[PDB]
Amino acid sequence: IAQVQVQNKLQLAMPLLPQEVQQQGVSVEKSSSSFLMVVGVINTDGTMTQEDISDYVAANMKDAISRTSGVGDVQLFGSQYAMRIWMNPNELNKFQLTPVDVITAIKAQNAQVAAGQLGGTPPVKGQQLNASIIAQTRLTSTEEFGKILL
Amino acid sequence: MPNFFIDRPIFAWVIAIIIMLAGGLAILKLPVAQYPTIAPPAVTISASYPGADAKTVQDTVTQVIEQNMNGIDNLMYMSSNSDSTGTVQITLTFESGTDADIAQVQVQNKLQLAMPLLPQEVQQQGVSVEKSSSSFLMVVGVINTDGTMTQEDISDYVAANMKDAISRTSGVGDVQLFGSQYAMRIWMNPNELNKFQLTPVDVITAIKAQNAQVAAGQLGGTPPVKGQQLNASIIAQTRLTSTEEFGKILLKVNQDGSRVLLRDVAKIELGGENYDIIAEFNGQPASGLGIKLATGANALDTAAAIRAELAKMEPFFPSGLKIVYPYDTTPFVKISIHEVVKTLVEAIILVFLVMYLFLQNFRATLIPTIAVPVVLLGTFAVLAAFGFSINTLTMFGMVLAIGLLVDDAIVVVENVERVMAEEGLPPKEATRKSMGQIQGALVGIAMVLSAVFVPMAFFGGSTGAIYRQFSITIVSAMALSVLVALILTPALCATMLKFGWFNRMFEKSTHHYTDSVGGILRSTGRYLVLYLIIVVGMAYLFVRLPSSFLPDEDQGVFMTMVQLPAGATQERTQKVLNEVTHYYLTKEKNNVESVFAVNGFGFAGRGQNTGIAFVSLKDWADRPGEENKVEAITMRATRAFSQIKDAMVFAFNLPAIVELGTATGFDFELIDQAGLGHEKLTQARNQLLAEAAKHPDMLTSVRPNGLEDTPQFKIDIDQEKAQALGVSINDINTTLGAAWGGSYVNDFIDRGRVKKVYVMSEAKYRMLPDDIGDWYVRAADGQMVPFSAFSSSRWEYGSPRLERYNGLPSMEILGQAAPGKSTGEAMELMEQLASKLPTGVGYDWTGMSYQERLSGNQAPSLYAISLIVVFLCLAALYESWSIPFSVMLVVPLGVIGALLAATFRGLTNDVYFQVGLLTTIGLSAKNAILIVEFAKDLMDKEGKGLIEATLDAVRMRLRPILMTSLAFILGVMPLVISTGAGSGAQNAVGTGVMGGMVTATVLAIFFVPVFFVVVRRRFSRK
Amino acid sequence: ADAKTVQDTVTQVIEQNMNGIDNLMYMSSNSDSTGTVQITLTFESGTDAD
Amino acid sequence: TAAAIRAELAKMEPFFPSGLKIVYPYDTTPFVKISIHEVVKTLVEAIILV
Amino acid sequence: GVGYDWTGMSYQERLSGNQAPSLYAISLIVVFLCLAALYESWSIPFSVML
Ligand SMILES: COc1cccc2c1C(=O)c1c(O)c3c(c(O)c1C2=O)C[C@@](O)(C(=O)CO)C[C@@H]3O[C@H]1C[C@H](N)[C@@H](O)[C@H](C)O1
Q: Are residues B417 and B468 in the same domain?
């Protein structure tokens, strides 16, 4: 309960938080101040980096560990990868663009979305062939992004 | 005690009255319900996004959504599928017997956060979070019989008018709809619409602000001005509330006073919300309403009340509203129940009759017969005292118990009409000294006994529970008995207690019988050989005896499996259903009572491609033999249902306990592990599978439980051109979207009930890649362009459904053990075959195969602890690390009688039989104790001589044993062992004992006296 | 500005739904002009509120 | 928990990249394991002086 | 097509009413029976209870 009770209330300020909080979701949890336990993960053959690890780790194992009883908070000594768009001003000052511009890009060319489909759900008189209609996908490599057309 | 009680037996009747009273309150205070609660508590998480496709749900949806299920408490494992029609299930099964209210919270309330990055399309249709269960109490259906009502008008009405009816009645654990409720439908046509230079968009926004709700002051309320007197409430804009009002939206005005309404671009109409599940019952528009328990009410009352409620209310809304019940779990209980107390009741009767025969008497057969009932009736408030409840598990729980209730009664009165015969005092000291010799024995055979039962309430999971049902029952029954025979029986029969051949003619075979045996015991160890044979041989049987859970049972309903091929489609899957309707209505009128089939479900995943069809038979009555029942009706179907097209149609009987661990089968999920993608996994998936079938030795039938890559028609917006042509990528996307997957504008209220509104183009314009075209965007300049303008089409393959095991992509494969082999030795091959696959590809077990794996085998360790405490108790009924060792070697004698349910009958080692196989080693080793007591009693007291005792001690026993032994073996052979319908576990319960009882006697009489000496003498040697 | 408007819009829904829920004795709502609504559940005594 | 955590990872160890080792720094478990056993020895032990 | 129930105090009230004629009954019967056991006499109670 408490954990309960608390998020009854919370929950009625969701919808006043700034969208950007919001959206990195808020968390509630119960647990111990101190740490149970710390789990190194280095790599032998200098085969990956500081970064690389922290992605693998988050991509790999921060999961299950948080999702896993009485584990009730795993810090993560690192961060997972993200699509990164270290801008440069000079330029967008040159070709005459602001991040705003850059951004709106990023939502458009990097995006998943939702057609419908050919055997049309409520269909017609009398039809064979039904199948989905796929449009825009979600970008997927360093590359896709910054070939985005500005 | 029973000495201080024989005395005041006026008391041991008060005692006999509370105990009794308490099972009347408790009979009343008792739940009743087909089974109890034996599956682990899952929460499912349902989601929808009109027109997605998989990646586009998996990556807009499942994920993240995963990613953040992360700090709920007891969870076992999670999966998750995302398929091609919006949906996301996401069940998360949890540890043994958590709190369901508390999981579900948590689960969800940690959803609450989630949402923020769930996409505005979803956010709006709701994710709901809720509890496993996807079949229970009854399923009312609502039909027309005019051709008046389509689906939707029927679904509507149901939702309109009865759904809450019902969903509030004593029971009724929630209602769920076999339809929709009207929808403001709004079917665009890019023609009648490009003519105005209008996209769906402008249709969209229009319907938005033409139909909303706008705030608006009062007149005072706030701070007002000196001396007002008017407060009212201003009433701005209000939801539209018809097809009319809707057809009147100024989508455009051109300078000619121009009137571009909605219906001038579309067509308004009351519609359904989802259009893609065609439900009919008997050829006929349908719209059922499923409805589940209530958690601690009573299947029996509850159905009543729902039948009730319908009945008051079909005096209403026009045409035929005929309300069928094409599923009820109602009979199947009642009809059980009725046949269960039929068992008790009669197994008493039998005591009485097998009570003339052994005792010329009457006020003695009047004893067992007010003592069982008083042992039952209290075993009703023990149940109600550990919550339990009245269900097919618990019921049979006391029938596989009868044997030991009964016995314990005759056991006491009959020690009395031995000792009050064989030169003995009146009732008085007859009892006092009678009771006396059994007193200790009677107790102490608690202990020993409890130890061969308790164990069993400790087991695994889903399974363990069934067992615990059985375990308590028996215990608190049996252990109830003892206590009632040390108290109401000593003082009962001690207070009322005073052919032409059989009498002296039994006093014949007895004499003749102990001779025989007196030679057995000259030789001595002669038969100990003829024993090890009988040991040895059990051992051969145990192994041979097949395994399981609960023998399937006929339930008066089963199912048909339609499953049209790749890209199928509704229209063309109906036809299939219509045949699986016909070839059920026609070639089976004397049994099909009602086909209720529906396309767009087949729990393999949804979509015009698949339906499923539940038929519900006529009453078992009207179904004579073998051929007229299920296994059999379905037999013929299945075979008569191949010869059909290229459309695979199966039929099958539901499993025992719907919600639970079916086949003895395995469940095997392939997980993903790294980068490997859909494809790579699809590679592993296949390799492994193919592997598997080159090993029919370990036997098998591995299957992907899930779907092939089908082809995908793929648009593909050309961003450059689109800027270029002056055309917003939102307008494209949208317009394609709402043309084709429809979108859901806002709501409106329809004769009192807010109801969604959907906007999406007629079908005519939306069927074939070839129509893409009809569809035209306004772009920046008033120039209405088309697709080819800025988009290109290509076919692809990809997934309609997409698997993911806790957090992460995963397939799913299930197959059988092996005519030959064990579920366990088969797991273990399938895991070597899994050993040697492309790195990345993991593999892990679910369902059943978490059960079976985890706990799984424990028969062993739990039985050590009985066969141990059986000893430690037993020896201190005796004072001897050795004499007890004679009461044991009984165990097998009883087994082989049981186990020849192999080679006389077509059966398998299954809970119903083990639980038997328990009940039989009660009677048995307590024969053993009594006997080897009587054989102790002499020797210890009046030294009555090494064997002199053994021969005398059986000498005085062969009745009691033969007495109940006779009661039972008839007690069980009734319907139990021969039965038409509502049965099965009937057969299971009996055949077990019935056979295991035989020997438990027939072997016992001779051996046990053997045993006694064989061991009392060996332990004082040379 | 919305009388019945609320009662059909939030209140109803929230009610249709208040089934299942153990130990529940009676429920009792009421819309409102200002658009506030109070559904209310009350359960058989000594039930576990939390 | 620790057992579970530990035999989670343990469950995802045959499939990390190239050379990547869970190591094990600061973990507070095994003392409370050893410790609480330390005592136990003492029970048996001073069974044996008595 | 119109009717009623009670709420709060009342529905408590009515509930507390119709309960007595059991509360007496069962309580009697419990004593009568106690006396029996106690005074070993299926008869002595009859007295007392009268
Ligand atoms: C793992 O759960 C299940 C497993 C197997 C197959 C099934 C289900 C299942 O739950 C299920 C349903 O719950 C429902 C239906 C159903 O056919 C099945 C299964 O086949 C049919 C239904 O959609 C109609 O017949 C409507 O015309 C009604 C109902 O909808 C339910 C389920 C929705 N997903 C839910 O959000 C809604 C309110 O109730």
A: yes
Q: Are residues B836 and B702 in the same domain?
A: yes
Rounded-to-integer distance, Cα B329 and Cα B555, Å: 8
Q: Burial letters for B916-931: b for 16+ Cβ neighbours within 10 Å, e otherwise?
A: bbbbbbbbbbbbbbbb
Q: Does B115 share its domain with B171?
A: no
Chains D and C touch (3+ CB pairs under 8 A): no
| Closest-CA residue of chain C to B215 | C1
- Cβ of residue B18 closer than 8 Å to a chain E Cβ: yes
Q: Is the dihedral of CA B290, B291, B292, B293 positive or negative?
A: negative
The residue among B164, B172, B302, B746 with the most chain C CBs within 10 A of its CB, best to mutate, is B164
| Domain CATH code at residue B813 | 3.30.70.1440
CB-based contact, B571 to chain A, within 8 Å? yes
Radius of gyration of chain E (CA): 18
Of all protein residues, the one whose alpha carbon is nearest to atom 20 of ligand 1 is B601
Q: What is the CATH number of the domain that holds B199?
A: 3.30.2090.10
As a whole number of angstroms, the distance between CA B247 and CA B267 comes to 8
Please classify residue B427 by burial: count the beta carbons closer than 10 Å to its beta carbon, then call 0-12 exposed, 13-18 middle and 19+ buried: middle
Closest CA to B1 of B490, B450, B477: B490
Residues B1008 and B884 in one domain: yes
**Nearest protein Cα to ligand 1, atom 9:** B134
Q: Which helix (H) or strand (E) holds B561?
A: strand B557-561
What residues flank ligand 1, with Cβ below 6 Å?
B 44, 46, 128, 134, 176, 178-179, 277, 279, 598, 601, 603
Position of tokens 């064997």? B947
Distance (Å) from CA B182 to ligand 1 centroid: 19
B649/B726 same-domain check: no
Distance to chain E for C23, nearest Cα, Å: 15
Residue span of the structural domain in which B733 resides: 710-798
With contact defined as beta carbons under 8 Å apart, do A139 and A107 qualify? no
Instruction: Provide, for chain A, the percentages of residues in helix, strand and coil under a 3-state DSSP scheme, each rounded to the nearest 5.
Output: 35, 5, 60
Q: Which atom of ligand 1 lies closest to the CA of B151?
A: 27
Dist CA B976 CA B967 (whole Å):
14
> Residue B294 is part of a domain; what is its CATH number?
3.30.70.1320
| Gap between the Cα atoms of B169 and B166, Å rounded | 6
Domain tally for chain B? 8
Which A residues, 64 through 123, put their C-beta within 8 Å of a C-beta on chain B? 64, 66-69, 71-73, 108-109, 112-123
Q: Write the single-letter amino acid at B226.
A: K
The answer to whether A124 faces chain C, any CB pair under 8 Å, is: no
Tell me: do B562 and B682 sit in the same domain: no
Q: Same structural domain for residues B341 and B447? A: yes
Method of determination is: X-ray
Contacts of B330 (CB under 8 A, 6+ apart): B138, B299, B300, B303
Residue B753: how many other CB atoms lie within 10 Å: 19
The span from the CA of B356 to the CA of B379, in Å, is 28
Residue B352 sits in the same domain as residue B444: yes
Rounded distance from Cα B134 to ligand 1 centre (Å): 7
How far is CA B365 from its chain centroid? 42
> Is residue A1 packed enough to be buried (19+ CB in 10 Å), middle (13-18) or exposed (0-12)?
exposed
What is the structure's resolution, reported in angstroms to one decimal? 3.3
Pocket test residue of B134, B281, B292 for ligand 1, highest count of atoms within 8 A of CB: B134
Question: Is residue B483 exposed (0-12), middle (13-18) or buried (19+ Cβ within 10 Å)?
Answer: middle
Rounded to an integer, what distance in angstroms lies between the CA atom of residue B388 and that of residue B395?
11
Specify the CATH number for the domain of residue B44. 3.30.70.1430
